[PDB]
Each structure stands twice: as C-alpha cells, then as structure tokens.
C-alpha cells in the first residue's frame, strides 16, 4: 500500500515501481486521482519487461477525467461493496484500537454505529437524503476527537448529551449539507442514537446497555464485542435498521426498475 499526494509520495511511488520493475511486487496506488497533473505527465511518460510485475490503480467514477489513452493500455475493473451495516461496523471497530475510562470507548462505539447508519442512508439517493453525500473516516476521526475532548473536561456522570448531539448534527456531520431536510433528518438520527437513555434501541433487535460504575476497559471491550457478535441482520435491514418506510424502499426499487427498463428499451431502438 502506497498513497500518492505530496512530492515525497510521488518519489516513494517512483521508487516502489522501480523496485517492482527490478525484482517484482504487487503495488496499489491508492487514490491516484488526487495528483491528476502528475499522473498525466508521469504515467504517460512511463507507459505511452521484468517478469512477475503487478501494479494496480485506484480512481473514482465521480472524479476528474482520466486520460483516454491511459485507460486503453490497461485492464479496467470496478467494484461495488455490500452495504452491510453489520460488516462496516465490524470493519470500523477493528480499524480502531480503544483514552479516558469506559465512557470514552462507549461513546466511540455509539459513534461507530451512528457513522454506519449515516453511511447506509447515504446510498439511497431519493429517500434517505436529497443528494449524493460523501462521508468518510476523517469525519469519524473529528467526531471521536471532539467526543474525547468533551469527556476529558467534565468526567462526571451527567454527560452533556444535548451539546455533543447538536455539535455532531450541525458542525461535524452537518458541514456538507446545504439544504434543510438533510439537516433535519441528521438531527433526528442524532436524537435517536446519542440519547444515552437507560437502554438504547438503535434497532428492534439488539439493545446496548450503558456501562456501570466499576467496569474496566478490557472486559468492557469484551462485552461490547460479545453484544456485537450476537446481532443478526434481517432481510428488511435497508428499511428497519435506518427508520425508513416500506413504501419508501418500494419506491426506490420501482424507480430502479423503471430506469433499468427504460435504458433497455432505449437500447432496443438501435
């Protein structure tokens, strides 16, 4: 793995591809779109014969226009992942490690679930939101740092849930929102998730109890992983895990059918 970017990143990429052209290797240039001018000069000068030389690209469909001749002297593949809310919760849980007691890790756990719910709602363009938003892990990092900084000041039992909820909905997760309805639905989801009641019900299946006043962090992490493994994913996850009506997902699927069938019927004319 080797990201592009600054001049040091470009030199590292050049050295790594030189090493793989000398003796071999498997190289993935992650997010190569961010250095488009350097790509347009360097990759053109490179491609337009050592054995066991493999390297890959990483572009974005909704990004800058790649050079046409570069796309014709390679093999283009695309990949869509599963929208597994459980799977992305597991991935984000394993990406992090944990620091202030057990309230901090409980808040990070709740934040990971909130981020997964928002990212799951992102894909449904006509009902979940009003446009194609692009959330990522940097927003999660800022939210986690804000939560840690709040919990570092007032370590008492009366956690200001309203303040962190408003800061998440307006400033953290509401920065990229331009209109009002998306802000309203993000505020509603913040109220549902960050309530911090006696027993939280993010989905009708599993419930997350709050930590008590004597738990150590290791066995609390064990308990939260155990309540993570006990969850099940029902067949109606795309409408029951995100609080969406059944008629809404029916509308989404009939619009999908309408657009694919209209595309086919336009194909059959010529």
């Amino acid at each position: 793995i080797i990201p592009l970017g600054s001049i040091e990143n470009l030199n590292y990429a050049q050295e790594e591809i030189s090493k793989s052209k000398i003796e071999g290797g498997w190289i993935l240039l992650q997010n190569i779109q961010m250095s488009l001018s350097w790509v347009k000069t360097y990759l053109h000068k490179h491609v337009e014969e050592h054995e066991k030389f493999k390297m890959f690209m990483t572009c974005h469909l909704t990004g800058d226009k790649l050079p046409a001749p570069l796309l014709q002297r390679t093999d283009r593949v695309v990949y869509e992942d599963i929208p597994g809310i459980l799977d992305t919760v597991k991935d984000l849980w394993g990406s992090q490690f944990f620091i202030s007691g057990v309230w901090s890790v409980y808040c990070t756990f709740l934040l990971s679930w909130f981020h997964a719910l928002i990212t799951a709602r992102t894909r449904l363009v006509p009902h979940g939101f009003s446009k194609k938003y692009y959330f990522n892990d940097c927003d999660f990092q800022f939210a986690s740092v804000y939560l840690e900084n709040v919990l570092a000041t007032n370590s008492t039992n009366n956690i200001p849930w309203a303040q962190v909820r408003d800061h998440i909905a307006t400033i953290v997760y509401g920065g990229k929102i331009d209109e009002e309805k998306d802000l309203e639905v993000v505020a509603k989801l913040c109220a549902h998730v960050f309530c911090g009641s006696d027993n939280l019900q993010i989905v009708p299946g599993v419930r997350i109890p709050q930590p008590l006043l004597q738990q150590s962090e290791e066995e609390e992490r064990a308990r939260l992983t155990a309540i993570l493994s006990n969850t099940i994913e029902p067949a109606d996850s795309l409408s029951s895990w995100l609080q969406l009506p059944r008629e809404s997902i029916l509308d989404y699927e009939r619009l999908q059918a309408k657009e694919v069938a209209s595309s086919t019927e336009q194909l059959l004319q010529e």
């Binding site: 600054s6 961010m34 488009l36 309203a162 800061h167 920065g175």
Partner: protein
C-alpha cells in the same frame, strides 16, 4: 547570402536613445537574428550563438540597468563591503564595455547573474530578519532599504507592509505611535531612539514588539480599571479600541461565569442595559473617531446583551450550559509570566491563543447566530491543525466572516481577493509570507483560478497543511527550506458550479461548510439599533420583508440586486439624510427612494411605489438652480426629466461612480450636462467635463503599453488625465469639480483594469507599478446603451441609474432645436411666430403617429 551575413556581422553598432549617459541601445533584433541564423559553417554557427548571447546581454542589461540607474547607482545603504566592491567592479567593467570578447560577455552574464542573486538573497536576509518585508516586491523593498535616513517613505507603504496601519506619527525623529484607518492613534509604551546608523529590521522589530507590549499593558490597565468599577464611558475616550474590547470581553466572561455558577441574570442584564443606554447617550454627541469607537463597542455590547437575554430564558441548567458553551468566550492566564499569551479564547471547549496584532478600528460584523456557528466550525477545524473552508452562493458573508474571526482572535488576515489578473509569483510569495509570519491567508473566490494555477496552489496548500499536521518546523516550499511558525493557518472560500469543488487531496484535509442564508433580520435590527432609530425591530422587519417581496415581484433583470450588500449600503447611506430629516420611517423611505428607485424600469417602478405605499407610510434651492441652468441652456422641464435629474443629483451626492443606461435619444447626456451646470451655479465650484469613448480607444491607448524592447512607458489618455489632475499645477482642481464620462459600451476587458477604480481603494493598477490616488472630487461617470455584457460584480460596487422612457416630449425637442438654430444664426420675431404657428402639435402628433 554569405556576403550579406558577413556584412551584417561586421556592421555591429548601437544607437543613442537612452537618457543621460546610460547605455547605447541596439534595436531591430529579429532581422539580425535571422541573418545570424565545414569550418566556415561552424564559425557561422558560433557567430549566430554569439548573436543570440548578445541579444540576451542586451535584454538582461536593460532589465538590470533600469533599476541600477534608478536606485543602485545613486544609493548606498541598499548595498551596505563585498557588495560594494562587486557593484563597483561590474559597474566599471560594463561601462567600459558599453563605451567600446565572447568570454568577456559570458563573464558579464555571470557577473550580472551573481549580482542579481546577491541582491535577491540580500532581500531574503531582509525577509528572514523581518518576514513582514516579504509582502513587498523587489523594487519596492529596495526603495524601503534606500529610504533608511529619510524615515518617511514607509508611511505610504505602511498599509501594504502590515495591512492595518496607514501612517506613522513622528517626534524629533523618534517614534511615538502609528495611525489607524480612521485616524485612531496607537501610542507606544515607550518611545524608541532612532540612531543615525540603523537598519530597518531592528527598529521595525522593536516597533511591532512595542506594539504588542503596548496593547498588552493597555489591556492590563483597562482590566484593572474595569475591576475597580470604572464606568465604560470615561474609558472609551482614554485607551485604544483593541484593549477596551479585550478588557470588556474578559470582564463580561468572568462576571457571567460568576453569575452562572448560580441561577440569576436580571442584575447583570439591567446593568448592561444601563451601560448600553449611557454608551448611546455618549455616542450622540462625540466626534467621528469616537463615534466609530462607540459604534464598535455598542455592537459588541449588543452581542453581550443578546447572549445574556438568551441565557435568561433557559428552562434548565443544561440548556444554559449548552447555550453558553456555543458562544465565543474570552479567558485569561494569570499564572504564566510571559507577556505574549496571557489571554486566550474558547469556543465549545477549545483553546486558541491571542496574537497581540493591531486590527485598527474596522467595521464589526453584526453578531448573528450563523456567524457564531461559523466561528465554531473554524475553531473546531483549527483545533485539529486543519484548515477551514466555505462554499455556497455568492454574496453570503464568507470573506467578511473570515475577517471578523481574524479581528476577534487578533490578527490581520491577508485577504487574497484573487481573479484572472493574479499570477503564480504573488500568490506563492504571499503564501510563504503568511506561513512565516503566522498570519492567516484567506482565499476569496478560489474557483476563479485557471486550471494549472489552481492545481499548483492546491499542491502548495496541501503541502503546507501536511507540514502543519505533523508539526515539523521546516517544510520544503518554493525550492527552499522555509521555516513554519506553529501558529500559521490557511483558509479557503468557494463558489462551485458557476467551476468545481475542492480537489480530492484538499478534500482529504479540509472541512466543508455552507452559510447560504445570512440572517438579515438580526443584522438589520442591530444596525438600526446602533443607528439610533426609535423603532429598530419594526423598521428592520419592514425593510427586510419589503426587499424580499420586491425581489419576488420584480422583473428578472440582470442588473437587479436586492441581497444584503444593498441593504448595508442603504443603512450606511441613511445617516447623512438622517442628520437633516431626523430619525424615523420617513428618512429610510427617502433613502429607499434615493438608492433603489432609480434602478427600476416602469412596471417595476409602479410595483415599487405600490408596495412602498402598502407596507411603509409614504430642497427648493437646488431645484430652482437646476431650472435656471436648464432655462439658460435652452431646455424644458418636463416632470419626468426634472424627476430623473433629481434622483441623479441625490445619487451623485453620496456615491462617486455613477452609470447611466438607456436607448438612443433618451436624454442622458443632457441630464448629466444640466446637472453639472446646476452644480457649478449652486456650489460655486468650477466644473470641467471630459468626454471619452472607451471603445474607439484601444487599451494600449486608453492606459498605455510597456515597450517589450525599447523599455519605455507611454501614458494613456485616461492616465494622462489622472496625472494632470493629480499634479494640479494651476490649483483649479482644489476648488473645481472634475467629471470624466465614458460615452461607450461596457467591455469587460476594458473594465478589469477599471476594477481598482470601481473599488473603494481609489487607486489605479498598472503594469508599471506606480500608484496615484483618486481624489473624492474625482467623479467617474458612464454613458452606455445596454447591460448585456457586464458582470454582476460591477453593477453592485457602483451605482446604476435607469432611463425608462423619453425624458421630454416632441415639442420640447422642436423648441430646443429652434433655439439652438436661432443662436447659430423685426423680421426675426415674425419669422419665429410663423414658424411656431406652422408647428401645430394637434396635426403634428397625428402625422407622427401616422408615420
């Protein structure tokens, strides 16, 4: 061919075109290079290479010797021993060469390049011993070093060097203070003794260091006075505005915490109500600078009163904590003995340190909740060593919000209001300067950049943010190991889709935000409150609702603008009319009729009048003077023409950049001519009118062109008028009005150079570098036909007047032309009478409508 080439090579000569001794120049380079371009063949190739090197010699020696004969050969403290001997050696050698050698001219290239590198690296010694020098260009900074004993050339360049200081006061060649934008003086804690043998770095460092310690000490003693119970009215006129603001904020924060540990607010609310009422009473009789001071203090105290009143109506303690944590708080450090960071600000549980940089006395943005949310998101981004961002519709308060944040935290944000005119060099220089100083560099309209400059500046800002995040002192930038103070930051503002979003690399390290709708209700309410009106809230709601319905129910014209900038202009223009019309609804109605009415059509005007009668309730000397002036000129006063003349007079009374639009034969030239004549008769000032057509004159003739080969500058007609009116040899322009008109269309290419004039800078931008001011007596006027090819930026920065229909009837035209022809010329009386009775309108209108 070979004989001609040999003759041209052996016919080397020069011409005497330079000034004084100078250097004998040579011209017609293309023919010589074409003539220049196997032993004889390689000799000819070497001769062609020598000819190209001679062309390079001539170009570089012109470019160097212009500045050399300007400053280098007549000044010594810029080269202050090694530079002395190098300069005199190159001077004598190249003077001998010009008086009368391929290796000699190659060594001349080497010596000139070494001298250029030496002077540039001397400039970098200036910019490392004092990095505020790095805002300036090479020639300007050379002039700064050369004026080391005059001690008065830094006053005019002081605004460019720092950003908020206009002039320096003096006392027997010892510094006492500096002057702000609005005449406010910044006195020092102690004067500095200006020794005879000093260089700019040392006394400028003690100058800004004493500025920092001076505002520190003034804030300390103002805090002591406020803790002693001293009232604000006596301390407003005593100390500098910055110290007063910091002391007031610190006292308010400490007292509101001491009253927030319990649950009560009525005592401090009544105290601040009495304080603001007394402050307004003191405002109502003070002078101009004191009026601005009390204006800013009353803005901040209105913010304090708003925060306290919001906190009072909280139902629970947690609601109070939520609402208080989101408000920008000011704290103090009474433990650290250092005098640089005893004060810091906090917003939503974060920590940023104050800078002790003077802001002057600027206008303060009205504290609206949207501005507080913007401050919160910027301090959230700056807590994590990231950069803030802004994107949304145009004219929604982004650059002003950034400047407000810079003024609160106490640093002059260097606004890079960029367009197509700027190149890479100035942006890179100002970015590295912002890096080294620790002053925030904001970008305005980042989408306006061209593709390659946008990509490269994106790379530069990405590198500087990466260096900020990892916290390394040295970051590779502009092919140099530029140090980075850990207090610098970068800002950005966008308007996408009009181009693009942020690039992906910048999207990785930035936080987006949108402020599409400014809260105009609270801004208008508090601007009416500071303006002194009896009913601020009702008038503010009425004017905002009226403007909204006007924007909804008018024609979709490109020249219309009813956002927030126009409302701010309305409220900043009310007060001179308030001073004679009093305070009330009538004066704001008259202001609306004075600045928004003339830009409408006819159906738009009837809609405007109907709505003004709906929501709102509703000078003879100038009129009589105008009537007499027109009667002398031979015109006739129709009601529409007299009305439009009246709006034009009342519109030029305040603004100084008026444009006129209308069809052919509408009567705009007559309108401004008779208004100028009335002005000359009434005010007693002489009036002179200059007529320019901006299309038949090219840009190289309107402004002038630099010679790419002759190295000479020609003043254009507009520029020649500016120099001959600025010099004022005859002294007439002191007591006379100047009026230049632009009787042509509006070419965008011909107004991009005018953009400096149409802004409030009142300066001329030129490829040369010399700047001459625009006097308030200078009045630019326009005479156009249509607004199809004009940007919506220029229609807002300057006033617009619309001519809906013909100013006069037909018989007025017959009478005026009859009088003009008679002026060109008992028989006359009867001939005029028979001409008049032959001109029967009863049949004339019939034949005109039948023709």
């Amino acid at each position: 061919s070979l004989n001609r080439i040999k003759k041209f090579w052996k016919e080397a000569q020069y011409e005497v075109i330079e000034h004084s001794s100078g250097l004998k120049l040579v011209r017609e380079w293309d023919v010589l290079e074409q003539a220049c371009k196997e032993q004889d063949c390689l000799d000819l190739e070497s001769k062609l290479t020598k000819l190209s090197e001679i062309q390079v010699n001539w170009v570089e020696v012109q470019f160097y010797w212009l500045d050399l004969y300007g400053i280098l050969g007549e000044n010594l403290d810029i080269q202050n021993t090694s530079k002395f001997k190098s300069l005199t050696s190159e001077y004598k050698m190249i003077t001998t060469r010009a008086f009368q050698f391929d290796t000699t001219l190659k060594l001349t290239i080497d010596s000139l390049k070494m001298i250029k590198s030496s002077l540039s690296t001397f400039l970098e010694r200036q910019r490392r011993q004092f990095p505020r020098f790095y805002f300036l260009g090479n020639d300007d900074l050379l002039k700064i070093i050369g004026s080391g004993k005059h001690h008065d050339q830094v006053s005019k360049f002081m605004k460019k060097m720092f950003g908020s200081i206009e002039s320096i006061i003096f006392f027997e060649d010892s510094i006492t203070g500096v002057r702000s934008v609005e005449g406010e003086v910044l006195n020092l804690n102690e004067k500095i003794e200006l020794k005879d043998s000093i260089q700019a770095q040392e006394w400028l460092n003690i100058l800004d260091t004493e500025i920092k310690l001076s505002v520190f000490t003034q804030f300390r003693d103002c805090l002591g006075q406020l803790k002693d119970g001293t009232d604000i009215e006596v301390v407003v006129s005593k100390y500098i505005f910055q110290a007063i603001l910091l002391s007031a904020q610190v006292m308010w924060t400490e007292l509101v915490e001491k009253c927030l540990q319990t649950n009560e607010f009525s005592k401090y609310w009544k105290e601040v109500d009495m304080k603001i009422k007394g402050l307004l009473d003191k405002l109502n009789k003070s002078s101009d600078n004191v009026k601005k001071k009390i204006e800013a203090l009353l803005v901040e105290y209105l913010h304090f009163n708003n925060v306290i009143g919001q906190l009072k109506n909280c139902s629970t303690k947690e609601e109070a904590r939520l609402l208080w944590a989101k408000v920008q708080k000011f704290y103090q450090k009474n433990d650290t003995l250092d005098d640089l960071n005893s004060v810091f600000i906090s917003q939503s549980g974060y920590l940023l340190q104050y800078k002790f940089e003077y802001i002057g006395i600027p206008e303060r943005l009205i504290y609206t909740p949207l501005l507080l949310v913007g401050f919160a998101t910027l301090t959230d981004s700056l807590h994590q060593k990231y950069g803030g961002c802004f994107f949304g519709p145009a004219g929604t308060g982004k650059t002003e919000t950034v400047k407000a944040f810079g003024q609160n935290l106490g640093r002059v944000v260097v606004v890079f209001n960029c367009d197509d005119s700027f190149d890479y060099q100035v942006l890179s220089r100002l970015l590295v300067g912002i890096t080294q100083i620790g002053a925030w560099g904001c970008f305005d309209e980042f989408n306006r950049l061209d593709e390659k400059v946008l990509s490269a500046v994106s790379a530069n800002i990405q590198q500087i943010q990466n260096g900020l995040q990892v916290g390394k002192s040295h970051i590779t930038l502009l092919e140099e190991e530029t140090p980075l103070s850990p207090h610098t930051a970068v800002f950005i503002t966008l308007n996408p889709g009009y181009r693009s979003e942020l690039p992906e690399n910048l999207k990785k390290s930035f936080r987006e935000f949108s402020m599409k709708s400014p809260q105009s209700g609270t801004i208008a309410e508090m601007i009416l409150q500071i303006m002194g009106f009896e009913d601020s809230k009702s008038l503010a709601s009425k004017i905002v609702h009226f403007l909204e319905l006007l924007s909804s129910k008018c024609s979709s014209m490109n020249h219309y603008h009813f956002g927030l900038r126009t409302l701010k202009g309305v409220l900043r223009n009310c007060s001179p009319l308030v001073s004679e019309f009093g305070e009330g609804e009538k004066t704001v109605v008259e202001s609306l009729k004075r600045v928004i009415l003339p830009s409408l059509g006819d159906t738009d005007e009837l809609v405007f009048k109907d709505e003004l009668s709906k929501i709102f309730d509703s000078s003879k000397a100038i009129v009589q003077c105008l009537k007499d002036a027109g009667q002398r000129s031979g015109f006739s006063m129709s009601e529409e023409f007299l009305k439009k003349c009246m709006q034009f007079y009342y519109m030029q009374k305040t603004q100084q950049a008026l444009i006129l639009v209308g069809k052919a034969g509408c009567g705009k030239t007559a309108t401004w001519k008779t208004v100028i004549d009335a002005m000359a008769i009434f005010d007693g000032h002489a009036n002179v009118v200059y007529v320019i057509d901006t299309k038949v004159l090219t840009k190289e003739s309107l402004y002038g062109s630099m010679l790419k080969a002759t190295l000479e500058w020609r003043d254009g007609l507009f520029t020649s008028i500016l120099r001959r009116v600025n010099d004022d040899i005859t002294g007439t322009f002191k007591n006379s009005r100047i009026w230049v008109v632009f009787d042509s269309d509006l070419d965008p290419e011909y107004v991009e150079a005018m953009n400096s004039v149409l802004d409030d800078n009142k300066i001329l931008t030129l490829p040369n570098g010399e700047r001459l001011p625009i006097p308030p007596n200078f009045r630019i006027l326009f005479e156009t036909d249509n607004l199809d090819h004009t940007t919506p930026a220029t229609i807002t920065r300057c006033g617009l007047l619309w001519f809906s229909t013909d100013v006069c009837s037909i018989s007025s035209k017959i009478d005026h032309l009859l009088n003009k022809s008679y002026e060109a010329l008992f028989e006359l009386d009867k001939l005029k009478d028979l001409i008049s009775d032959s001109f029967d309108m009863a049949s004339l209108t019939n034949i005109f409508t039948c023709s």
